[PDB]
Each structure stands twice: as structure tokens, then as C-alpha cells.
Design an enzyme around this catalytic site. Sequence first.
Site, short mmCIF file in Angstrom:
data_model
loop_
_atom_site.label_atom_id
_atom_site.label_comp_id
_atom_site.label_asym_id
_atom_site.label_seq_id
_atom_site.Cartn_x
_atom_site.Cartn_y
_atom_site.Cartn_z
N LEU A 165 0.39 -4.85 3.56
CA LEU A 165 -0.64 -5.34 3.27
C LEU A 165 -1.03 -6.76 2.53
O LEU A 165 -1.62 -6.87 2.85
CB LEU A 165 -1.25 -3.74 2.62
CG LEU A 165 -2.51 -3.36 3.50
CD1 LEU A 165 -2.46 -1.65 2.78
CD2 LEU A 165 -3.42 -3.07 4.49
N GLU A 200 2.19 -8.29 -0.48
CA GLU A 200 3.23 -9.09 -1.13
C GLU A 200 3.29 -9.48 -1.94
O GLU A 200 2.04 -9.83 -3.21
CB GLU A 200 4.83 -9.04 -0.38
N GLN A 248 4.44 -4.95 -4.31
CA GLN A 248 3.90 -4.85 -3.56
C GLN A 248 2.84 -3.91 -2.95
O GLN A 248 2.66 -2.83 -3.50
CB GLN A 248 5.12 -5.06 -1.62
CG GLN A 248 5.25 -3.69 -1.54
CD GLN A 248 7.14 -3.82 -1.04
OE1 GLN A 248 7.59 -4.70 -1.22
NE2 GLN A 248 6.64 -3.35 0.34
N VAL A 249 1.74 -3.71 -2.03
CA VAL A 249 1.26 -3.11 -1.25
C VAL A 249 1.04 -2.32 0.18
O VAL A 249 1.45 -3.71 1.07
CB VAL A 249 -0.30 -3.07 -1.08
CG1 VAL A 249 -1.12 -2.22 -1.20
CG2 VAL A 249 -1.00 -3.55 -3.09
N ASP A 309 -12.84 -9.35 -13.09
CA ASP A 309 -12.64 -10.38 -12.06
C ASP A 309 -14.21 -9.91 -10.66
O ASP A 309 -13.53 -10.25 -9.49
CB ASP A 309 -11.00 -10.92 -11.27
CG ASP A 309 -10.88 -11.93 -10.32
OD1 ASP A 309 -12.20 -12.98 -9.53
OD2 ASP A 309 -9.96 -11.67 -10.30
N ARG A 324 -14.09 -11.24 -2.56
CA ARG A 324 -13.13 -10.64 -2.30
C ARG A 324 -12.59 -9.20 -2.39
O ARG A 324 -11.75 -8.86 -2.10
CB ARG A 324 -11.82 -12.37 -2.46
CG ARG A 324 -11.61 -12.14 -4.57
CD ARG A 324 -11.25 -13.18 -4.69
NE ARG A 324 -11.35 -13.64 -5.81
CZ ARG A 324 -12.10 -14.52 -6.82
NH1 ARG A 324 -12.70 -15.96 -6.41
NH2 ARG A 324 -12.56 -14.53 -8.43
N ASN A 325 -12.63 -8.95 -4.32
CA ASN A 325 -12.09 -8.08 -4.97
C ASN A 325 -13.55 -6.48 -4.74
O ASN A 325 -13.16 -5.85 -5.07
CB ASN A 325 -12.20 -8.20 -5.82
CG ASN A 325 -10.88 -9.22 -6.76
OD1 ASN A 325 -9.88 -8.28 -5.87
ND2 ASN A 325 -11.18 -10.00 -7.54
N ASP A 382 -9.32 -3.19 -7.55
CA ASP A 382 -8.50 -3.52 -8.45
C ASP A 382 -9.18 -3.91 -10.12
O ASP A 382 -8.81 -4.70 -10.04
CB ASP A 382 -7.95 -5.62 -8.23
CG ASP A 382 -7.39 -5.56 -7.40
OD1 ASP A 382 -6.70 -4.44 -6.32
OD2 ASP A 382 -6.89 -6.47 -6.67
C1 LIG Z 1 -7.25 1.11 5.52
C2 LIG Z 1 -6.57 0.16 6.53
C3 LIG Z 1 -6.44 -1.08 6.25
O1 LIG Z 1 -5.25 -1.58 6.98
N1 LIG Z 1 -7.30 -1.98 5.89
C4 LIG Z 1 -7.59 -3.06 5.42
C5 LIG Z 1 -6.93 -4.48 6.40
C6 LIG Z 1 -7.30 -5.36 5.92
C7 LIG Z 1 -7.43 -5.69 4.30
C8 LIG Z 1 -7.56 -4.81 3.72
C9 LIG Z 1 -8.28 -5.25 2.67
C10 LIG Z 1 -7.90 -3.34 3.63
N2 LIG Z 1 -8.50 -2.54 2.99
C11 LIG Z 1 -7.51 -2.02 1.79
N3 LIG Z 1 -6.41 -3.23 1.14
C12 LIG Z 1 -5.74 -2.05 0.20
C13 LIG Z 1 -6.15 -1.42 0.03
O2 LIG Z 1 -5.90 -1.25 -1.39
C14 LIG Z 1 -5.37 -1.85 -2.44
C15 LIG Z 1 -5.07 -0.95 -3.91
C16 LIG Z 1 -4.14 -0.86 -4.37
CL1 LIG Z 1 -2.94 -0.39 -3.89
C17 LIG Z 1 -4.52 -0.35 -5.84
O3 LIG Z 1 -3.21 0.79 -6.39
C18 LIG Z 1 -3.72 1.21 -7.50
C19 LIG Z 1 -6.31 -0.37 -6.77
C20 LIG Z 1 -6.99 -0.78 -5.65
O4 LIG Z 1 -7.88 -0.86 -6.44
C21 LIG Z 1 -8.76 -0.38 -7.30
C22 LIG Z 1 -6.62 -1.17 -4.29
CL2 LIG Z 1 -8.15 -2.71 -3.73
C23 LIG Z 1 -7.86 -0.73 -0.11
N4 LIG Z 1 -8.25 -1.26 1.65
#
Ligand SMILES: *CCC(=O)Nc1cccc(C)c1Nc1ncc(OCc2c(Cl)c(OC)cc(OC)c2Cl)cn1
Length: 271
Positions: free
Chosen positions: A21, A23, A25-26, A148, A152-153, A166
Site C-alpha cells: 500500500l 513504502e 512499509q504497509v 496532523d 489525507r489522514n 495515524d
Molecule cells: C483495504 C483495501 C485497500 O487497498 N485500501 C486502500 C487503497 C488505497 C489507499 C488507501 C489509503 C487504502 N486504505 C487503507 N490504507 C491503509 C490503511 O492502514 C494504514 C495504517 C496502518 Cl498500517 C497502521 O498501522 C499501525 C495504522 C493506521 O492508522 C491508525 C493506518 Cl491508517 C487502511 N486503509
Amino acid sequence: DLPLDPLWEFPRDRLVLGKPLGEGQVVRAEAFGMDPARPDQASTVAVKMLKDNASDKDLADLVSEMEVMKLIGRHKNIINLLGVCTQEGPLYVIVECAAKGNLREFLRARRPPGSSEGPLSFPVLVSCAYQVARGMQYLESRKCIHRDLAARNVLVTEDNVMKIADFGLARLPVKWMAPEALFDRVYTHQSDVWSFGILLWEIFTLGGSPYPGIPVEELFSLLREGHRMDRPPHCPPELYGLMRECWHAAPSQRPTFKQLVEALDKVLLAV
Ligand SMILES: *CCC(=O)Nc1cccc(C)c1Nc1ncc(OCc2c(Cl)c(OC)cc(OC)c2Cl)cn1
């Protein structure tokens, strides 16, 4: 290295890593048994992890984000912790995956051509703002200052639910920052309320760039001499009124997240 937490540990053999998603990385993943009721059933999740080049501090930061997310606990309008992999292999932090991406891109993709009507009604835009205010009210109740908050967040689920992203990150988007944060490096719940006001403006411009034209150089002087963004086109006065309250110079004169929830509730009840 890391202790096994029986409230959160998830079997890494039941987590199928997929397409990156972003890097550390996620990566997107399929998780089997995130619902203990139906343990066979798959669900799409996001997994945060380190890259090989990561230092001891990088690991400490990801452990800190995991631990703060456990303590804050769950809410409809935040990206929730789902599970962790800490034993016999790399640290995985598993969270909810929002199908429709971030709120900025969601709004920009739903801009109509020129002066025509878009699919996004006034009640839907106000609902987006209300859900973000409910999420921030919850985080505030769990002693979490975001620092923040911006479109975008905020992420958007399959059913158009807003989830704040985040919020657990370890300690420059100056166009979202309260003056006390710009000038004095102080972040409070009331600094977050200023950012919420900028987010409200992002929602009612369908993902517009704040202070459009004005370079970061002239921003600080603009704010000091009492100037703020103008009411965006087709934005009702009631909601511009809320933006301008969020942008009071005095943190104590800004609304609380409780008062923002109540104000946005009153708008939604009136339609
Ligand atoms: C779910 C299907 C998908 O691919 N969704 C997608 C596609 C493009 C962009 C985005 C933003 C998304 N959704 C999405 N992306 C990331 C995500 O989680 C990230 C994350 C992580 Cl890994 C984390 O780890 C501790 C903590 C977070 O915030 C508390 C977040 Cl946002 C979720 N959805």
C-alpha cells in the site's frame, strides 16, 4: 525480544501478505479468523512492518504505535488495531483496511464537471464532518492529540464511514497547523480543533488545497493580521461560521470537539 500479549496475538500462518500500500512499509493482506465467530472467513486488512534497513529506534517507534493503539481502544470512526504478530518472525501490526482510500482523494474523484451537480449531497458532506468530529471526540477522551488532522489522514470504508488514520504515531504541513503550533511548537486538543476547521474547508471544496496561491512564506503574516480562508462556493454560512470559530487565535475561544459534534448534529437534524 517482544512479550506475547494474549489479547492481541494473531497467528501469522493465518495472515496472507499481498500488494504493498506504501513504502518501514504497509502491505494489504487477507486475514483468516479476525471474526472468532466465523474463524474460516477472510477479511482484507493492512499490515505495518519494518524494512531490513530499520534501526533499534525504528522498532521502538512501531512498538510504541502498537502499544498506544491497544490502550486507546476501539471506535467506529478510527482505523482500529485488529491483531499483532510479535513471535518467531518480524513485528506485524494489523489494522482495518478502508476500501475507498483517503477522504481527500475520495472527494476529488467525486468532483462533477464544471458547474454541474456532483454525487455528494450537503447531508453526505456534513455527515463526513460529523463522523470525523465523533472520532476526534473519542481520541480526545483517550488523551490522544492527533497533531496532523487533515483529509489525507481520514480514510473511507466501503459504506462511506470516516476513519481517522495515524493517530498513534511517535513524535511540515503548516497550512493545517494552529498558530501556537507554528510559532510555539505546542500541540493540544484545541490545536487539533484548528486543523479540524481546515479539514471542514477541505470537505466543502471537495478536496481543495488550503490558502490557494499564498506561499507558506506569507501564511504566518496573514494569520497574525487576522486573515483566514474565504467561504468556499456553495458552502452555507452555518458551516463557514464553524470553520471561523475553529480558527480563533485564542485556543480557549475555539469550540471543543464535543461542541463540534453537537453543532454538526444540529445541522443534520435540521435537514
Ligand atoms: C483495504 C483495501 C485497500 O487497498 N485500501 C486502500 C487503497 C488505497 C489507499 C488507501 C489509503 C487504502 N486504505 C487503507 N490504507 C491503509 C490503511 O492502514 C494504514 C495504517 C496502518 Cl498500517 C497502521 O498501522 C499501525 C495504522 C493506521 O492508522 C491508525 C493506518 Cl491508517 C487502511 N486503509
